[PDB]
């Protein structure tokens, strides 16, 4: 994804978090996301449980969560 975003999502700013989500909505062809539900930095985004994501993005929250978790694993691997 955008090279501007730091490798470790846990270090993302609030705006980095929004870029990631907008990129995901396009990349996965997701329905309009309610960004009011995601006004948070990377630290907190990464703490959302799968169910948390599910509530904020019904239908694809689990996919988004897994992608995010994978990006974290990756920031290390």
């Amino acid at each position: 994804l955008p090279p501007s975003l730091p490798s470790d999502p846990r270090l993302w700013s609030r705006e980095d978090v929004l870029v990631f989500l907008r990129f995901c909505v396009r990349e996965f062809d997701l329905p309009k996301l309610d960004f009011d539900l995601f006004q948070m930095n990377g630290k907190r985004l990464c703490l959302l449980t799968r169910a948390d994501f599910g509530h904020r993005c019904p239908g694809a929250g689990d996919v988004l969560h897994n992608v995010l978790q994978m990006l974290i694993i990756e920031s290390h691997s």
Binding site: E27, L30, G59, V63
Partner: protein, 82 residues
């Protein structure tokens, strides 16, 4: 490049629209009720489906979800043969 069914041969090129058409075809093929709610459980494209584990399919469709997973994997497998 589309297959017999109107769907692109490579599942990774599937838009959400393609995913929905594939779901409707699977319902018809498997003799499952064709409902508007089935596709609503999958508001995503093929790229997203590639990331879905069997567990995520069953969660959405407990009755028949494994056939969806199985069918998508078969399509993806032959596609990767590029």
């Amino acid at each position: 490049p589309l297959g017999s069914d109107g769907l692109p041969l490579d599942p990774r090129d599937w838009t959400r629209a393609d995913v929905w058409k594939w779901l409707i075809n699977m319902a018809v093929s498997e003799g499952l009720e064709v409902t508007a709610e089935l596709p609503q459980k999958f508001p995503m494209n093929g790229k997203a489906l590639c990331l879905m584990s069997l567990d995520m399919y069953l969660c959405r469709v407990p009755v028949g979800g494994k056939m969806l997973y199985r069918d998508f994997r078969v399509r993806l497998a032959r596609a990767m043969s590029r």
